Design an enzyme around this catalytic site. Structure first.
Site, PDB file in Angstrom:
ATOM      1  N   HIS A  46       0.806  -1.212   0.000  1.00 26.76           N
ATOM      2  CA  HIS A  46       0.000   0.000   0.000  1.00 26.76           C
ATOM      3  C   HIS A  46       0.835   1.256   0.000  1.00 26.76           C
ATOM      4  O   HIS A  46       1.887   1.288   0.613  1.00 26.76           O
ATOM      5  CB  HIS A  46      -0.898   0.120   1.227  1.00 26.76           C
ATOM      6  CG  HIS A  46      -1.563  -1.148   1.661  1.00 26.76           C
ATOM      7  ND1 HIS A  46      -1.414  -1.628   2.942  1.00 26.76           N
ATOM      8  CD2 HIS A  46      -2.420  -1.989   1.026  1.00 26.76           C
ATOM      9  CE1 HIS A  46      -2.122  -2.742   3.067  1.00 26.76           C
ATOM     10  NE2 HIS A  46      -2.741  -2.979   1.925  1.00 26.76           N
ATOM     11  N   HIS A  48       0.766   4.650   1.820  1.00 27.72           N
ATOM     12  CA  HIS A  48       0.176   5.185   3.034  1.00 27.72           C
ATOM     13  C   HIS A  48       0.182   6.694   2.988  1.00 27.72           C
ATOM     14  O   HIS A  48       0.830   7.284   2.126  1.00 27.72           O
ATOM     15  CB  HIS A  48       0.924   4.634   4.261  1.00 27.72           C
ATOM     16  CG  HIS A  48       0.504   3.243   4.643  1.00 27.72           C
ATOM     17  ND1 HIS A  48      -0.075   2.943   5.857  1.00 27.72           N
ATOM     18  CD2 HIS A  48       0.556   2.078   3.955  1.00 27.72           C
ATOM     19  CE1 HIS A  48      -0.336   1.647   5.915  1.00 27.72           C
ATOM     20  NE2 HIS A  48       0.028   1.097   4.773  1.00 27.72           N
ATOM     21  N   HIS A  63      -3.970   4.280   5.016  1.00 24.51           N
ATOM     22  CA  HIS A  63      -3.766   4.225   3.576  1.00 24.51           C
ATOM     23  C   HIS A  63      -4.037   5.577   2.951  1.00 24.51           C
ATOM     24  O   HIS A  63      -4.926   6.292   3.403  1.00 24.51           O
ATOM     25  CB  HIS A  63      -4.679   3.194   2.935  1.00 24.51           C
ATOM     26  CG  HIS A  63      -4.433   1.804   3.416  1.00 24.51           C
ATOM     27  ND1 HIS A  63      -5.098   0.702   2.912  1.00 24.51           N
ATOM     28  CD2 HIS A  63      -3.585   1.328   4.362  1.00 24.51           C
ATOM     29  CE1 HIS A  63      -4.680  -0.386   3.532  1.00 24.51           C
ATOM     30  NE2 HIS A  63      -3.757  -0.037   4.412  1.00 24.51           N
ATOM     31  N   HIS A  80      -9.099   2.716  -1.806  1.00 24.91           N
ATOM     32  CA  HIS A  80      -8.163   3.793  -1.535  1.00 24.91           C
ATOM     33  C   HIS A  80      -7.225   3.942  -2.720  1.00 24.91           C
ATOM     34  O   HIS A  80      -6.800   2.956  -3.314  1.00 24.91           O
ATOM     35  CB  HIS A  80      -7.360   3.492  -0.279  1.00 24.91           C
ATOM     36  CG  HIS A  80      -8.180   3.213   0.935  1.00 24.91           C
ATOM     37  ND1 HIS A  80      -7.813   2.283   1.883  1.00 24.91           N
ATOM     38  CD2 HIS A  80      -9.336   3.769   1.378  1.00 24.91           C
ATOM     39  CE1 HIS A  80      -8.698   2.298   2.865  1.00 24.91           C
ATOM     40  NE2 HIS A  80      -9.641   3.171   2.568  1.00 24.91           N
ATOM     41  N   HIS A 120       3.543  -5.430   3.845  1.00 28.97           N
ATOM     42  CA  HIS A 120       2.979  -5.994   5.059  1.00 28.97           C
ATOM     43  C   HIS A 120       3.298  -7.469   5.253  1.00 28.97           C
ATOM     44  O   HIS A 120       3.695  -8.143   4.317  1.00 28.97           O
ATOM     45  CB  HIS A 120       1.464  -5.812   5.037  1.00 28.97           C
ATOM     46  CG  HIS A 120       1.016  -4.413   5.293  1.00 28.97           C
ATOM     47  ND1 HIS A 120       0.684  -3.975   6.554  1.00 28.97           N
ATOM     48  CD2 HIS A 120       0.868  -3.351   4.474  1.00 28.97           C
ATOM     49  CE1 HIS A 120       0.322  -2.708   6.497  1.00 28.97           C
ATOM     50  NE2 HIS A 120       0.421  -2.301   5.244  1.00 28.97           N
TER      51      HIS A 120
HETATM   52 CU   LIG Z   1      -0.695  -0.813   4.739  1.00 30.95          CU
HETATM   53 ZN   LIG Z   2      -6.603   0.641   1.588  1.00 36.28          ZN
END
Ligand SMILES: [Cu+2]
Ligand SMILES: [Zn+2]
Ligand SMILES: [Cl-]
Ligand SMILES: [Cl-]
Ligand SMILES: [Cu+2]
Ligand SMILES: [Zn+2]
Lengths: 156, 156
Positions: A46, A48, A63, A80, A120
């Protein structure tokens, strides 16, 4: 035409280099590179909110979500902006990354430059969690701890 | 109103945290924080072109210079936008930084977000070098090696 890069580092033996290239006419951004030191399998990936490493990857915030939507996968119409799904680590702990995106920009008010890229520990459920998992699913994808991160910086 | 931060790291025992705060109405940006591990005295301090740490602080490129000017000091009418002069390390190796700027922006096409902040080994001569020193003076200020750097990222 623009180029950016994130050098991923952290406290978990995970590192990597991820490039972003946005074409002239800025419609499509290609995200590519590799990440090593990963447990084999799927790892959430992601952009962020913050490019703040004062508290490791924790200070990256949530996010990147300038349109105030729920969490999803990169192919989803509702997601997102920072949602890049999962990258896949092989048996040797290396994930090769190749993602094309119409939503990730390097120019303009939605630019991901200055934000943190984060890998992650667990799989991102892409907002498909059910039962008592659904609240966190629609926030983060339940992808667990932040293993490595880097600020997305301008590249030559 | 906007906030950014650079976490400075490197191979020379130098580290620090530098914040940027730009007021609403975006006229003035305050740069503040501290850097430790420095030899006592003056150390050159610049925003560089690239936020690329793939080759340590070397891949940061030259000074951020969107208007194509010669190197100077932060108070000069002709300077690189990224020229922030010298910070001053005390006998304990700590430099406390406090700089106000009309030229450093966190918003718009001239934003320093995504660029690298870099602290140097030697004094920046602010473009005042003479004789055979003048060529490098008007490029870099002759401030010597890059001791630490960080990508300027968005902060809460
Ligand atoms: Cu994340
Ligand atoms: Zn997200
Ligand atoms: Cl394109
Ligand atoms: Cl102001
Ligand atoms: Cu420099
Ligand atoms: Zn300069």
């Amino acid at each position: 035409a623009r180029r950016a890069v994130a050098v991923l580092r952290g406290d978990a033996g995970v590192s990597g280099i991820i490039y972003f290239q946005q074409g002239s006419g800025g419609s499509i951004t290609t995200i590519s590179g590799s990440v090593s030191g990963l447990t084999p399998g799927l790892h959430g990936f992601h952009v962020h909110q913050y490019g703040d490493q004062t508290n490791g990857c924790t200070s990256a915030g949530d996010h990147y979500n300038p349109f105030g939507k729920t969490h999803g996968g990169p192919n989803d119409r509702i997601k997102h902006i920072g949602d890049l799904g999962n990258i896949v680590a092989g048996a040797n702990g290396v994930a090769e990354v190749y993602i094309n995106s119409y939503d990730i920009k390097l120019r303009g008010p939605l630019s991901v430059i200055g934000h943190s890229l984060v890998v992650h520990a667990n799989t991102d459920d892409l907002g498909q969690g059910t039962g008592n998992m659904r609240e966190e699913s629609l926030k983060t994808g339940n992808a667990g701890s932040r293993l490595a991160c880097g600020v997305i910086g301008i590249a030559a």
